[PDB]
Amino acid sequence: MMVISEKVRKALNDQLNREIYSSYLYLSMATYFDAEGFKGFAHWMKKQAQEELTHAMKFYEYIYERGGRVELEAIEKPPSNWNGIKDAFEAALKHEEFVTQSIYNILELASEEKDHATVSFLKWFVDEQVEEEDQVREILDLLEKANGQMSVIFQLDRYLGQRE
Amino acid sequence: MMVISEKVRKALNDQLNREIYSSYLYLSMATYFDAEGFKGFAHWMKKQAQEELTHAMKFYEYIYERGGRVELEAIEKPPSNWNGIKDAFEAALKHEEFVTQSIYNILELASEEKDHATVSFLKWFVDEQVEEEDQVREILDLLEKANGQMSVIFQLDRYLGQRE
Amino acid sequence: MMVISEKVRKALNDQLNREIYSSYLYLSMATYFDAEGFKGFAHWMKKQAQEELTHAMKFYEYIYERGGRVELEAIEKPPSNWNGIKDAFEAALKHEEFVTQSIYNILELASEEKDHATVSFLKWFVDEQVEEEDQVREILDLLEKANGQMSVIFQLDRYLGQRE
Amino acid sequence: MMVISEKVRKALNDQLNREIYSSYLYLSMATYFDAEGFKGFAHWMKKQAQEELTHAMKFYEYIYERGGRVELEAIEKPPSNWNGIKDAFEAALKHEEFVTQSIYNILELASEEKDHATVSFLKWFVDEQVEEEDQVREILDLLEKANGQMSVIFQLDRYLGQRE
Amino acid sequence: MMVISEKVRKALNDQLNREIYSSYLYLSMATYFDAEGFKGFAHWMKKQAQEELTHAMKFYEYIYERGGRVELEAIEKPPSNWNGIKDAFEAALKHEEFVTQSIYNILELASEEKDHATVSFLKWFVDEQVEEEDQVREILDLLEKANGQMSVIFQLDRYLGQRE
Amino acid sequence: MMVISEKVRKALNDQLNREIYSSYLYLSMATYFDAEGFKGFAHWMKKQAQEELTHAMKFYEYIYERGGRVELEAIEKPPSNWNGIKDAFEAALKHEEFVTQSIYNILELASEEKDHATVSFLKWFVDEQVEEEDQVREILDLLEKANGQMSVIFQLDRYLGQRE
Ligand SMILES: CCCCCCCCCCCCCCCCCCCC
Ligand SMILES: CCCCCCCCCCCCCCCCCCCC
Ligand SMILES: CCCCCCCCCCCCCCCCCCCC
Ligand SMILES: [Mg+2]
Ligand SMILES: [Mg+2]
Ligand SMILES: [Mg+2]
Ligand SMILES: [Mg+2]
Ligand SMILES: [Mg+2]
Ligand SMILES: [Mg+2]
């Protein structure tokens, strides 16, 4: 028997599909950075894409743990070009903030149905999203300071290219 | 400057998106096996999905290596239900034979244009596909023998669930 | 279901039996050399016989990998006697060159049928044959220098006797 | 000079060719098991075939050790189809019992000629045949009990596939 | 006996002499960089020159393996000067692209003769050329970004000076 | 600024190109020993050829150390054929004696100019030339004791083929 409601199960399945799209968007940003010759930023984005797949799978295993099941939906075609490095990381921040709000909406839906197990499960993602948004804000800050200077950009590209 | 033809880039780009679809299909098979309580079969498919990502990224990196650019496309919704374990594995075999023909068509195209670099790059996929088809054919032959006997299926689930 | 044509499977199965005979021929050479007290030339021929069996088993596993089966045929009696050291090795070389041409014929047949999997599997043997032929030519060269001087042949015997 | 009679030499040379045939017979049994999809039974037979070849080379070396010469004969085409698993192993047991009687005939011939060296040398094979026949009788007993039940047959396959 | 045709042996020997010139051209680029004070760039070229010698020796050993003979020809004086760092690396890329087409020409010749051993042997060079051209394309892309800014040139020089 | 006289720089640059020719000559000799089936002698010459390049590069580095530049010149085609093993090594010895006298001429020139730094630099090559000459003479003496006995030639081929 499924002990999440269908409404909560749908919200969770929807978020899992959003996490898959996040992964794909970030790979698309890698394709841009690689085309522009910034292999470090592209590497950063490939690691981020893998990271989003772990989020997808966290939702996956929770849905099954609660007796639901996962239905994978079509993945929309992501954007594949940006007006520059900053424009790309700004889109990432905007995306991550939208993901944060999507998670908040599930949390409030679970709280209104008194699904305390799902409220509690989602705490992990609330905390993770703080980290996710702020790592992008940090990079955007460095790019605002570098102000186009290839000297600095080179070293940032190499720094982010070290992400484990 | 791009040293692959536009027609070969498009074939390689297309195949990269087929590898992503292949990854997603196998993840959908996992959602089905998990919904049916076969955590070992599902585990096997999750590993297969990750393996297909490695194929996509081999295409990714070769395209940039030849001066091209990757464009990510929409990913179609895969089926999410099969008529039992053997049906899912028959579909998987059919999918891998389709992938193999897709790979053959690029090789032949590349050969016709005398793109020896791409013909040689594609050898690795030719040899991998043979291994991929064989792995599924072997699982199918065992399930044909088992004739749905639950004790045989349980041992096969535990074995596939140990895949690294 | 078999994914090689019957024609290609027959070609491979025929070459499998050819590798078996190659093994037996070289053992027969070991019987000649062991008879003339050359225990080192005999040791080399017994190593070559064991290597031909690895060749046969490589075709074996590929045939089954592609859904065919193997049928073992009768093995013709090999020659048991040779006019001298260099008479035997020149039969070796002529045999290995016949093997190479048989391999080439399978390659061209597969290529004509667009069986890229078999064309690629055969690359391994095309490269080994280069080595198999070269090792005999080298030995014939060392013989055509020693000019029957048992002092040198005590060393040539000694050296082939060290083959691992 | 030869210090075995020609009759004892012919007896030993015949037995060497018989062990070569034994090796080929078990390899044919492997082609059957693999065709039937039992890679563990097939593995056991491949290991047997390699062992039947150590037997041949022991005769080989004794013959040269007594001043005789080996001559390799044609090898007959082995059977390639059995009715089922148990029939193949039964044919294996029948073959080993025939090999045992063949060894006995040499022993009794060497004993008549007072060739005490050959008599002593053959004790190894006598004792070894006891083990070869026993190991096949054990498998047959398990297969009799399995009574065609595929759940059990699969368990035997896996076990015999671990043979070292 | 030489088992390669004279036309193929000539093409191969010609390529070998082309690899020697390649080595010498990169040494000459080293002489230019060392004169301009870029020890790191010069170091990169000195390692590249040693790498071309391994290419030459690979060709050398294959020729003798197919019963042919190597004849060393005169080496042209390479250019001694370039109009800046980018100019040198553009010359390097143009040379490696010419080397790649030279190799392609041998492969198409060997394939027309059905000289499969040589077609197969040249695969290694087809794959290596992909990397040789791409490593130079990557250097040229960073140099474009640096745009003559010495603080970035120093960064690239010390990095290329790390090449092992 | 250059602190060697242009005359000394031209002599050093000339010798650098002479060491490059020496490397090429010794490789040509390897082409001859390999054509003749003496792989160990061929091996010795290949090792000598690499050693020759270290000599070249010691001149290279000293020229830049004194503020000069290197200019690479064309490399003449070497001979490829000797009348026998001893003929090749006699030619090697005569070449090295020529190199020794070329080095002496540079030392005498530098001495005439009171270029004490270059005089001292060249001491290394004076001592090394004594060795390079001695090792060819040792080999010629062993060839003379061998007196065409292929027994001994084979042992020297193998010994020289062990050179590190
Ligand atoms: C070099 C690092 C490469 C990272 C590749 C990241 C790829 C993410 C692509 C997103 C596509 C999603 C659709 C397939 C999902 C498969 C999930 C398998 C998870 C077990
Ligand atoms: C050193 C002795 C080698 C003699 C070979 C003679 C060939 C006769 C053919 C007999 C069949 C032998 C079967 C070989 C089985 C190999 C199975 C290995 C598993 C990979
Ligand atoms: C470590 C040395 C630094 C760079 C070496 C540069 C060589 C330039 C090209 C030389 C041309 C003459 C050919 C000599 C061939 C030597 C063969 C060696 C075989 C292992
Ligand atoms: Mg996420
Ligand atoms: Mg794939
Ligand atoms: Mg063979
Ligand atoms: Mg036996
Ligand atoms: Mg090269
Ligand atoms: Mg020198």
TrEMBL record, chains A, B, C, D, E, F:
Binding annotation for Fe(3+) 4: 52, 96, 132
Record: residues binding Ca(2+) 6: 131
Enzyme superclass (EC): oxidoreductase
EC number from the UniProt entry: 1.16.3.2
Binding, Zn(2+) 4: 52, 96, 132
Binding sites annotated in the UniProt record for Ca(2+) 4: 71
Binding residue positions for Fe(3+) 1: 19, 52
GO CC annotation: cytoplasm; cytosol
Protein name as catalogued: Ferritin
Species for this entry: Thermotoga maritima (strain ATCC 43589 / DSM 3109 / JCM 10099 / NBRC 100826 / MSB8)
